[PDB]
């Protein structure tokens, strides 16, 4: 009947309006946000240990580049080394070639740093834009340094946006750079439990599971965004003039009936993906990073210098536990609306 | 304590070989590199080795008779008079702290 078709269409559209354009009420949103925050968390937890500044063309093109992190700010030197007596050396990691299972090039580190800074600044300056929203433009700042014949600081401007698609791309760059090139990690001088003190572990050796989980979080979050635009551009129209057999022809009614199913199947896959992203967060957060990624509140390395002596390296400082609960609290609201959704799909299956 | 080099033989004959042994190599390394001359200088790099890798990456100074080993020693065969003088090893330990050491052999 007309009231039944109209009740189902309204339920789909009410849930679709929240799922697509909502923030705190949307598990699609909170899942995406979790993915983003999880990569920031990953980098904040173990980024400082990533060995960088191996040479790309030659050992005689000896380059360095320092990368700044602001907060209680810190700086990370790629290329150099620390001498026996404690002074800085311009010959260090740049004496050995950059590749898989060795060291990130300066070029690879500057992408992680750029991506991280865009992502960090976007989530603070403007939050994540809603998933159906086109996004809001915003300027990111990226502060680096080189050495001269004196040290030269340079802060770059990047015109970026806070739409999921862009922000997921930045996260993807961080995870895939680690996942694919597996740079070695710095050890303790004889701090997290995973940073050994003995030899020095390979990042994909230490964080293989975590990198895959972090990677899968992004792939699923992107899939959420694609099913959300499918959903957005697939809104069934309410039946008006119900008795009018010319206006409401069985053709454009079966069109609507299967337009409703596309709306429902997107919502299913989105909620399914969102629940996978939570499963993927548990994979990420329950190995080496269990006591680290979820919290925030003095650790060092020889390629690191702090403005003060505090800094927040070693633990995630990305509000992932807060976002995890928001994802759980939003997903149970949609998980109990399934009776309404299954009433509509069975009703739709008729036409 | 200190990283030191030893040339075997100490003085070499032209066309024969020399072995720069490494004493007191610290455990736990990221990698190391051998240089021609007194200075750690990129353009004089003969070869660099990374601990996980299995293969060593030569530099500009690689003449083609240099065999680095994974105990950090360097064999140089078919020595010329042009091989006279100093050779320098830089080690990068796992904590990114470097150590240096110089070697020399005299050819006759």
Swiss-Prot record, chain B:
Ig-like V-type domain residues are 2-108
Subcellular location per UniProt equals: Membrane
Sugar-bearing residues?
A: 71, 78
Cite the ranges annotated as topological domain Extracellular.
2-108
Q: In which tissues is it expressed?
A: CGM1a, the predominant CGM1 transcript, is granulocyte-specific. Not detected out of the granulocytic lineage, such as monocytes, lymphocytes, spleen, testis, colon, brain, liver, pancreas, thymus, ovary, placenta, skeletal muscle, prostate, small intestine, heart, lung and kidney.
Describe how it is modified after translation: Tyrosine-phosphorylated in response to microbial binding.
Q: Which family does it belong to?
A: Belongs to the immunoglobulin superfamily. CEA family.
Q: How does it assemble?
A: Interacts with S100A9/calprotectin. This interaction is calcium-dependent, but independent of CEACAM3 phosphorylation.
Domain remarks: The cytosolic domain is involved in S100A9 interaction.
The free-text function statement in the UniProt record for this protein reads:
Major granulocyte receptor mediating recognition and efficient opsonin-independent phagocytosis of CEACAM-binding microorganisms, including Neissiria, Moxarella and Haemophilus species, thus playing an important role in the clearance of pathogens by the innate immune system. Responsible for RAC1 stimulation in the course of pathogen phagocytosis.
The name this protein carries in UniProt is Cell adhesion molecule CEACAM3
Query: Whose protein is this, by species?
Result: Homo sapiens
Q: Could you say which residues of the full protein are shown?
A: 34 to 141 of 252
